[PDB]
């Protein structure tokens, strides 16, 4: 029931091959066991059985970045928890409330970000990303020469 089955119908198989196949497909439908009784598909002319479940995907950018870095470390941090709960929540406003952004980003680069060391962790990068989006002039004055990886990312991301 997340399965689609179809008949051999077209395909230039010979008529007798279509019959053998379609008798087998019809018999799978009849002898199917209720919990695996597939749905039939009529705009496929080719015979197959296929799982229609969604493939692996992520819609959250933090999760995407952590996945591609295999970096699941530091999610319990105050650093990360502030990133998520104090900064990233602000990004869902239609218009940014600038006075609050100003202190929260200030605070971010006071307590949590000082560095752009590296090796840069996903947690560091997610914090930097959120602060940059909210207050990049504070970033410019904070780190006027950025790690080149971060620099190349920003150069790409900044144009619409």
């Amino acid at each position: 029931m997340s399965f689609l089955i179809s008949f051999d119908k077209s395909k230039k198989h010979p008529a007798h091959l279509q019959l053998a196949n379609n008798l087998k497909i019809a018999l799978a439908l009849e002898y199917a066991s209720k919990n695996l009784k597939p749905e039939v598909d009529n705009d496929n002319a080719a015979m197959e059985l296929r799982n229609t479940k969604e493939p692996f995907l992520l819609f959250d950018a933090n999760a995407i970045l952590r996945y591609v870095m295999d970096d699941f470390e530091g999610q319990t941090s105050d650093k990360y928890q502030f990133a998520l709960a104090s900064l990233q929540n602000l990004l869902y406003h239609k218009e940014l409330p600038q006075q609050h952004v100003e202190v929260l980003t200030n605070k971010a680069i006071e307590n949590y970000l000082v560095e752009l060391k590296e090796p840069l962790t996903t947690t560091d990068l997610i914090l930097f990303a959120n602060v940059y989006a909210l207050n990049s002039s504070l970033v410019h004055s904070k780190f006027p020469e950025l790690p080149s990886k971060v620099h190349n990312a920003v150069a790409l991301a900044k144009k619409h």
Binding site: K53, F72, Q75
Partner: protein, 120 residues
């Protein structure tokens, strides 16, 4: 520790070991980010879609702590959506898979009759 988390950890199902793939690790990170940013409500159709194809949020046979964390905010939202609906059959269809999951979770955590979602 909230009342629901405390209840969950009182059950041995909370003790079932599971070694996450990196895919499951990402699914857990994704719902943490949705939770802590306060965006569960705009992501209900995404939750409903995940639960169409997965019994639990992080692609597991057993509820995990992600399920309890999300159910904690999701139950009140869905209950309100249902209580206020002028066509509860359609609402039920729209959120069919979240409602299956809610039913299980509110029974597992023995949610009180005032706080639970009266089901059909």
């Amino acid at each position: 520790m909230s009342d629901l988390v405390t209840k969950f950890e009182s059950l041995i199902i909370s003790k079932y070991p599971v070694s996450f793939t990196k895919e499951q690790s990402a699914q857990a990170a994704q719902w943490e980010s949705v939770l802590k940013s306060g965006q569960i409500q705009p992501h209900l159709d995404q939750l409903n879609l995940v639960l169409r194809d997965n019994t639990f949020i992080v692609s597991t046979l057993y509820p995990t702590s992600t399920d309890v964390h999300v159910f904690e905010v999701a139950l009140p939202l869905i209950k309100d959506l249902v209580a206020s609906s002028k066509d509860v059959k359609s609402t039920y269809t729209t959120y069919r898979h979240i409602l299956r999951w809610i039913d299980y979770m509110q029974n597992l955590l023995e949610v009180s009759s005032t706080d639970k979602l009266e089901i059909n």
